[PDB]
Amino acid sequence: SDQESNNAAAEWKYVAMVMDHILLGVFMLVCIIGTLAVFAGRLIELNQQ
Amino acid sequence: TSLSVPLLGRFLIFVMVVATLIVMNCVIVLNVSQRTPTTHAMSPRLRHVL
Ligand SMILES: CC(C)CCC[C@@H](C)[C@H]1CC[C@H]2[C@@H]3CC=C4C[C@@H](O)CC[C@]4(C)[C@H]3CC[C@]12C
Numbered sequence: 001s002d003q004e005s006n007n008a009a010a011e012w013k014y015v016a017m018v019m020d021h022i023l024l025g026v027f028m029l030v031c032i033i034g035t036l037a038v039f040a041g042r043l044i045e046l047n048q049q
Numbered sequence: 050t051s052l053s054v055p056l057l058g059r060f061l062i063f064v065m066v067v068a069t070l071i072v073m074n075c076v077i078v079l080n081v082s083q084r085t086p087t088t089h090a091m092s093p094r095l096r097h098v099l
Pocket residue numbers: 052053054058059060062063066
């Protein structure tokens with residue numbers, strides 16, 4: 001019974017790990033996109049002088 | 050002023066960057082150390098390297 005319970009718990013842990021990996025990718029991508037979307041328009045406008 | 054960066058500011062930004070890199074390093078080391086058979090597979094290449 002303990003082995004079955006641990007297997008179910010490990011399934012939950014695996015789901016959490018997969019969600020963590022997706023969110024790592026999403027949050028790094030969002031950091032890059034926010035940094036660009038805030039500043040790059042004005043920076044390219046100034047560089048085109 | 051903005052003609053140059055003061056030494057104090059340069060040093061503080063440098064140590065902040067070093068601290069950020071070491072935080073990333075600690076996160077990576079913890080990710081590697083707490084891997085268990087029930088979630089992660091045994092990479093033989095990394096094991097042979099390290
Ligand atoms: C992020 C880590 C690696 C560096 C931290 C220190 C930062 C603030 C340092 C590293 C290199 C530095 C630059 C190097 C050279 C110049 C040209 C000078 O005419 C004005 C200051 C300026 C533009 C410096 C500003 C401060 C600077 C950007």
